[PDB]
């Protein structure tokens, strides 16, 4: 569970609960159950807090790895209602943490300020003068192969 939260990639809520309900909510014979995810009122509160955390980790991972996500698709991906998902995303961005700008049909998870012409052109220029990795490529081309050039 911890490593799964450490790495990237989605976190399907249904699979997570179906794989960890018997452990986090109930008691295991080898390992006593947590007192923090029980049927107590704070147990349910922490359970819903985790449900938000899996949803917030989901959202952050999409913002790092998506551009435009349909609202229904995103809603089922984090296993929340459409309205509640939109409200949660709105809360997230309003706190000025996860940059995002939700449209009703686009709910974009980023696409930062559509790269203005200056930024986009600087990006293209950097990609071009990074193509000068070619010169290294060619000089090493003659170097590492010259000791084969005279061995043919």
């Amino acid at each position: 569970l911890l490593k799964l939260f450490t790495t990237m990639e989605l976190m399907r809520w249904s699979t997570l609960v179906e794989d960890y309900g018997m452990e986090l909510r109930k008691g295991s014979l080898e390992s006593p159950a947590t007192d923090v995810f029980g049927s107590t009122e704070e147990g349910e509160k922490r359970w819903k807090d985790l449900k938000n955390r899996v949803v917030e980790h989901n959202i952050r991972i999409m913002a790092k790895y998506y551009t435009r996500i349909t609202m229904k698709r995103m809603a089922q991906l984090l296993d929340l209602s459409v309205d509640e998902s939109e409200a949660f995303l709105s809360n997230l961005v309003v706190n000025k943490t996860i940059f995002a700008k939700v449209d009703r049909l686009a709910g974009i998870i980023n696409f930062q300020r559509p790269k203005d012409p200056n930024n986009l052109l600087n990006d293209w220029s950097q990609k071009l003068n990074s193509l000068m990795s070619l010169v290294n490529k060619t000089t090493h081309l003659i170097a590492k192969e010259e000791m084969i050039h005279n061995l043919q």
Partner: protein, 286 residues
């Protein structure tokens, strides 16, 4: 180790003088010397060098002499004159590496653990090859390949300190230079850049020809970097980058229009003053 080798324009002159001096009668076509310089765990600069009596035989390219005691004696002299410079590596012309380079490098490794070879090409100075620096490395050939030595290329620059830039400048000052880059020289620089890119592309294509016909063995990192370069090419389609038009038009206004108008108006005013001054002189002729 070292991520850059800085060669001052004195070891260049020392190498050229050594090459001419030997090649008066010394038709080995390739001479070997030792280059000293201030050492760093960072960018390494070289500031002086000397030439050792070296001999090489084209048979098997493994029988050779580098006078190591002569090396020691010259280094003693140079330390007495300037102890600040320590032995950094060895240079040799003849841009085609022979077989002894690593072997000779081993001999240089005892006088300098991080001995860097610096091929200083003398005759071919067409576009961009003042010098090429290599450093021996300890790896067999790759993850899963047999053993070898495999000199590694290091970025090399040409730079001078003060009281050496002045000598270069003074020997220069032909119709060359003009450090202020006017428009004509900038366009010339663009043409030179296109020429250099074309030359590098032709070198890569010649290598790919020698590989495709099987003359050369496949270098896997070479092909990997070729794929990387080919993927790195941008797209001038995709009408979001085409909105670069925007900034080009933006460029236009500040340049072109405004500047032209100003230049044209200034020229017109200069014509008014002349057309006035001329008629002033003519009326005075009265």
């Amino acid at each position: 180790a070292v991520q850059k080798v800085v060669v001052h324009p004195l070891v260049l002159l020392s190498v050229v003088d050594h090459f001419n001096r030997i090649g008066k009668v010394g038709n080995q076509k390739r001479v070997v010397g030792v280059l000293l310089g201030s050492w760093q765990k960072k960018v390494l600069d070289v500031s002086n060098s000397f030439a050792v009596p070296f001999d090489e035989d084209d048979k098997d390219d493994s029988v050779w002499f580098l006078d190591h005691d002569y090396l020691e004696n010259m280094y003693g002299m140079f330390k007495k004159v300037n102890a600040r410079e320590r032995i950094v590596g060895w240079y040799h012309t003849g841009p085609k590496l022979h077989k002894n380079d690593i072997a000779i490098n081993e001999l240089m490794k005892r006088y300098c653990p991080n001995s860097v070879l610096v091929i200083i090409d003398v005759k071919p100075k067409d576009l961009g090859l003042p010098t090429e620096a290599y450093i021996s490395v300890e790896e067999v050939h790759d993850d899963g390949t047999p053993t070898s030595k495999t000199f590694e290329h290091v970025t090399s620059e040409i730079g001078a300190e003060e009281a050496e830039e002045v000598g270069v400048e003074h020997l220069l000052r032909d119709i060359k230079d003009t450090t202020v880059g006017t428009l004509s020289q900038r366009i010339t620089n663009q043409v030179h850049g296109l020429k250099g890119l074309n030359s590098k592309l032709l070198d890569i294509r010649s290598y790919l020809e020698k590989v495709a016909t099987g003359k050369l063995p496949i270098n896997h990192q070479i092909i990997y970097q070729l794929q990387d370069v080919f993927n790195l090419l941008p797209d001038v389609s995709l009408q979001e980058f085409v909105k670069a038009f925007y900034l080009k038009t933006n460029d236009q206004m500040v340049v072109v229009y405004l500047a032209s108008l100003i230049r044209s108006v200034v020229a017109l005013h200069n014509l008014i003053n002349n057309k006035i001054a001329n008629r002033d002189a003519e009326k005075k002729e009265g």
